[PDB]
Every structure is written in C-alpha cells, then in structure tokens.
Design a protein around this ligand. Structure first.
Ligand SMILES: *[C@@H]1O[C@H](CO)[C@@H](O)[C@H](O)C1NC(C)=O
Lengths: 36, 253, 14
C-alpha cells in the first residue's frame, strides 16, 4: 500500500513462509553476482 | 511470454487479470499491491490512437489464477473497481512516458495461499538492485510467439537488465528516465521476452537482504516479441513512487 | 503494446 509495498508484503505463502524455494529463484540470486 | 515455462502454483500470488466484461476476454495484466489497490499500465486503459478508452465499469479483475480460461472455483476471486487513476503526465502521444495507473477495488480482497501482494521499492533497494546484468522476473498469460498459440496456464521468464545506451541504440523512439529495458543480447545464447497480453504486468526482483519480492517495473512497450537485437521497455516504478504515494494517501487505501 | 473463455457465473456482473 506504499513504500516497501506492504507489511507482510513480498513473502509467499507457499514458499517464503514455508521456507520452500521455487524452481528458478537461484538464477536471480546468482545474477546479483551473489545472492544471499 | 516467449521462451518461458509453466509457473508453479502460488508462485506469484500478486498477479492479476484485467478482464474484459464483454466480450468476455482478457485485457492485460496487473498486480496486487494492497487489499484494495491494483497496479497496471495506463495504455491498458487508455490509448486514443486506438480509441482505447475504458472505464471503471467496463472491466473485471480476477485474482488467484493459474488457468487462463477456466473459472477456478473456490480459488479465484473477482472484484470490481471503484475508481481509476492515470498519470496526469502520461505521454500517449509520443513514447509512453509515464505509462502507469492505479485501480481501487469495490471491496477489499482477502488473502489466501494463492493471493498476496508485492512490495514497492525504496530508494535504497532500488539503488542496490536496479543494475545491468541483474535478473528480474516477468509473468503473464500473453502470447507465446510473436505471430502465428496461447498458453494454458500462467507463464514465467527471468531476464537481465540492460545498459541505458544499448537500449537507446536499439530503437528510434525517444527514451526517458522513467524507463528501463530488459533482455538478452544476441551473443548470449539465451532468449525470452514478454509479448501481446503481458502488458501491465509486473517485472520483479527478490531482495537478497530481506528476502522479499519487489516490483521494479511494469511491462510497457516494445517492438515485436523476442526479436533478435530487441528489448522490452518497462515503467520505472520507483521514479513514479511519489505520485503513487499521493493518490493512495489522498484516496483512502 | 508490441507494435474461448469458460463462462463466469453472472452472479458477479453487478
Ligand atoms: C476516456 O473516457 C472518459 C469517460 O468515460 C473521458 O471523459 C476521457 O476524456 C477519456 N479519454 C480520452 C478520449 O482520451
């Protein structure tokens, strides 16, 4: 609803919240020279 | 989406469907940024060179979807719009400068396993992630091929952010600071792009500092789909953040 | 701009 989107914004119920990784996010993380 | 793959269930719970009341048909994409606020591209709603001029009443918004055609019973939600807002200085005449718009839903939507909003960048996040060679992700129910069929379920593709000058040297359209372009170069092997039907959608990034997904861009314009030597243009959400803050502040949330 | 749907139950059509 504003800066930084929301309060619980950005954390996926079926992933982040369950500590599950989707099939392609490593790709991203790695592009940042090194995600972590 | 061209050269993408099938999205897993619950992979983008913010994704939204601009749906044409009648003829009942898909319009564009958009995204959930709050319980009452949708975000899209102005050209989805208005584009006079084509008599495109929609109203609050002309359309339907569907959230929590995977399947393109099926009415996903007990999973998907449908809402109606209260009021539509376009950037006052949106340049439809020349180059789509400031292609952005806000939509306010009739009633607030309840979150679920399949429905959840995304975050909007801050100067820092924005500074830190908005860099060349960095990858973002695009989603949508648009075409799979430039000219020809259509997809069955939501498709996904991750692309790298390209350098200003390359973008600039890629076309004859006059480019502004409220844009960025994305995709692979030709010497890269890899392909992929958005296409008709993806517009208004979200271009996103995951923060490596706090793990959240942020919306950095809105699918804006381009020339063809996945043409070699070509890139997709995106509205620079951060640069338009103040406008959004306002309208949200002034209009209730 | 880059220069068959299953029915919906009317109940929604305001
Ligand atoms: C879209 O249609 C409106 C009313 O429902 C207008 O008042 C408005 O001027 C518009 N777009 C124009 C034609 O560019």
């Amino acid at each position: 609803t504003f800066g930084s989107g929301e309060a619980d914004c950005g954390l996926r119920p079926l992933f982040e919240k369950k500590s599950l990784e989707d099939k392609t996010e490593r790709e991203l993380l790695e592009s940042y020279i090194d995600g972590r | 989406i061209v050269e993408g793959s099938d999205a897993e269930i619950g992979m983008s719970p913010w994704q939204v469907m601009l749906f044409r009341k009648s003829p009942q048909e898909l319009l564009c994409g958009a995204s959930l940024i709050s319980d009452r606020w949708v975000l899209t591209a102005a050209h989805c709603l208005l584009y006079p060179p084509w008599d495109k001029n929609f109203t609050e009443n002309d359309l339907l918004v569907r959230i929590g979807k995977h399947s393109r055609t099926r009415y996903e019973r007990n999973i998907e939600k449908i809402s109606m719009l209260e009021k539509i807002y376009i950037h006052p200085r949106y340049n439809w005449r020349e180059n789509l400068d400031r292609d952005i718009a806000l939509m306010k839903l009739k009633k607030p939507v309840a979150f679920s396993d399949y429905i959840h909003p995304v975050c909007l960048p801050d100067r820092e996040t924005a500074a830190s992630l908005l860099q060349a060679g960095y990858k973002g992700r695009v989603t949508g129910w648009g075409n799979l091929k430039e000219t020809w069929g259509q997809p069955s379920v939501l498709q996904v593709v991750n692309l790298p952010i390209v350098e200003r000058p390359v973008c600039k040297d890629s076309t004859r359209i006059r480019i502004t600071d409220n844009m960025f372009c994305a995709g692979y170069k030709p010497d890269e092997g890899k392909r992929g792009d958005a296409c008709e039907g993806d517009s208004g959608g979200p271009f996103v990034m995951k923060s490596p500092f706090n793990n959240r997904w942020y919306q950095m861009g809105i699918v804006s314009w381009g020339e063809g789909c996945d043409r070699d030597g070509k890139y997709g243009f995106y509205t620079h959400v951060f640069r338009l953040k103040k406008w959004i803050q306002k309208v949200i502040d002034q209009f209730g949330e | 701009x880059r220069a068959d749907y299953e029915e919906i139950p009317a109940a929604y059509a305001x």
